[PDB]
Design a protein around this ligand. Sequence first.
Ligand SMILES: Nc1nc2c(ncn2[C@@H]2O[C@H](COP(=O)(O)OP(=O)(O)OP(=O)(O)O)[C@@H](OP(=O)(O)OP(=O)(O)O)[C@H]2O)c(=O)[nH]1
Ligand SMILES: [Mg+2]
Lengths: 418, 418
Amino acid sequence: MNLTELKNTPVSELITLGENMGLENLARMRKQDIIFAILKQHAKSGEDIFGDGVLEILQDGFGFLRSADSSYLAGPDDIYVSPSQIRRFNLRTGDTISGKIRPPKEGERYFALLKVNEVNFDKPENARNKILFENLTPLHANSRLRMERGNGSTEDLTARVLDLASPIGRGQRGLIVAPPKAGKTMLLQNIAQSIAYNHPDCVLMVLLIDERPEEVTEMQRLVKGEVVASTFDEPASRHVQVAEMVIEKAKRLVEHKKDVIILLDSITRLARAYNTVVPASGKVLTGGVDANALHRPKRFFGAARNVEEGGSLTIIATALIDTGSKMDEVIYEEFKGTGNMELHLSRKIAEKRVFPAIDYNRSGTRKEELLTTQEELQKMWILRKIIHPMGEIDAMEFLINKLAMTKTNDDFFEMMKR
Amino acid sequence: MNLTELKNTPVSELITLGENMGLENLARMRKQDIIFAILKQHAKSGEDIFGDGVLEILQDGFGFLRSADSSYLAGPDDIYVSPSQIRRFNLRTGDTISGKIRPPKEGERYFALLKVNEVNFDKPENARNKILFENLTPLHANSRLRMERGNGSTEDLTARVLDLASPIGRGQRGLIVAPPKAGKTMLLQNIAQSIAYNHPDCVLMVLLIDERPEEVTEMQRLVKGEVVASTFDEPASRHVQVAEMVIEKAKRLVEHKKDVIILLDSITRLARAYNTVVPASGKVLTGGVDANALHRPKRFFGAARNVEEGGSLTIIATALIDTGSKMDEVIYEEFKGTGNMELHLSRKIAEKRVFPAIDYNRSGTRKEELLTTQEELQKMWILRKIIHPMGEIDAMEFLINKLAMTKTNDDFFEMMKR
Ligand SMILES: Nc1nc2c(ncn2[C@@H]2O[C@H](COP(=O)(O)OP(=O)(O)OP(=O)(O)O)[C@@H](OP(=O)(O)OP(=O)(O)O)[C@H]2O)c(=O)[nH]1
Ligand SMILES: [Mg+2]
């Protein structure tokens, strides 16, 4: 029996399946309780069960395989694995493990792994000789990630506008400056769709911190891939835990020669959660924040890199400014010159209901010549020269108007070449 | 007899009933005590006493059927339900149980439930199979709640202004930012009347926290619905208990595919009560608040959603700003991004005796395309474009002057189009 099959099924179908098996009252308790009871009954039946999850090390030394469909939330059905297994097969937090599951015997409040048959989509033995994450050297991004949809639809307009504004490559550490009511989500959704279509091989995971519960559903419906989020109901501990699990899973994927892309929703929310969770170091920085608090956001953000051996790790993050909270621009002043590429959004442009509201003159990337070719580089340079004089809002209007008349980016290339 | 109808009777009628029943004193006791005495005297002869109430589950195992007449205050007349009944029918806190009761026996001082005949306005068997609230899928609000009644009276001006400014829908999570002496109570009263008029099907509850005793009675005599309040002369535990009972009752009602609307007089007062009642976690933010504390009010605020299966939970809570306290400031600080609808009251417009004192430029709703039609949305955009250059007080004066001339918002749009 497949645990993920039960998890993916709707709750009503789970209740009906349990009632067919029996168990009497099943509707009232949560989904995790339902799946736990159904799994226990099926194990009592005798048939072997196969389950998969993402491993995590707890402070007690034990391992837990959290599930992605629950946004890595601890639950009664969370498989728990002894440190003996971790010693037997070299494992750490973020690893994806699939195998047969032991029924919960006396003293077993959760399910446990009997035999492991898959580690990070690979055999257990082949995971021992892999190299850690930052043992691999950091290298400048060189392989361009093309996120032009190419269908000519209105959705592709923002993708190509950001592409000529500031190209994004594999392994880059992007940064988005998003004032309130600027279209941050309407940009993230398009970026996620472009990544999922143009580059299906790369693993796409979306991390949302301090989000509204209603937006999580639309994010997880629109994005083809893995969406994990922590709403504002959950404490800062949950935000930190989900962020750490996501970054560790990405690092483990990179170590396994996989290419993974992370679309972080907000650096500011993560930094606030980290400031809340960490103990005080005895020194209070400006704005009621801790020096040690700001370190772990840097640890999360700096993992974006183009590994010369196994692939890339791209982390696109968005910054919140002019929110009113002073810790927000404290975090901004911490990350002034950290991102490889920076895209700036403008509130005044968004006021006229013309989108995308970006500042083309400000938005740009460093060492762009590596990602693009010579012709693209000089074309971008002359475009910067010619749209440099006119105002940013008129610049955006002219850009969207001109890209509208052109089917693709090459049509624009030939248009400004004449 | 029925306990609820006895509770609804005035105190003098209760004393007369106790006297003609042949019971002495009953004058200087509280309402609950005289109710208990009357119930005991009638129970000595039987006649199958009835009673209903909202279930509050205590950690010891058993529960109590509180009444909304006393705003769920603990009293001698509360029905006592044993854990056996809570186990036979799956009952959680907030369930509305109605049935016959039995007189207390030797060794017990509370009336006990004898035979349940209604749970959540439904048969117990049907209520046992309901899906839990947490398993329901949140969604963006799409069904509008039109405040305007079209009467043309000067009271409808506030409703029409608010319909133009920040449209609301079933399942919204609204926030009213009100400085002191701006007119929040009158606005809440008007919203309650508009809801009771236009949408009689929705369940309307008005929750007042730390309110003055006279305002409580004013709201109870004005609002056509359920009003539960806890005055300032009560411990913060009382505020916490009342808020939790209200939210649990709302969740149970929503589980039955019902639309529930909750108007919260102050999220700031609720946050203060939670901060007082919660144990200190050792990390204290600016102003003396505990980061652990604000997790509980947020869970109250985050329950507002539009359930995909059916029903919705609208929560319109007022936030107090510029009250002269840093703790209230940080409480509002932690709550900006949670709401999908905001309405900003202005003291500058209030001091000129121009009402409603609504800051039109700084107030709005998120994703208004779903609630309103295309023509309504474009007309609203035209009006916003017209208003935007004006100052807040001039804009509100002009808007109210133009709005009073006609009767309905549609005719106002037609006139402005010309
Ligand atoms: N059709 C279209 N709309 C765009 C586009 N780009 C931006 N927008 C609009 O910009 C708004 C999105 O802003 P968000 O980033 O979602 O809001 P933020 O709070 O900054 O981030 P968050 O969603 O919390 O993570 C939406 O309008 P609101 O009604 O929510 O703003 P309004 O609320 O003023 O009515 C979008 O419709 C685009 O390319 N096409
Ligand atoms: Mg956001």
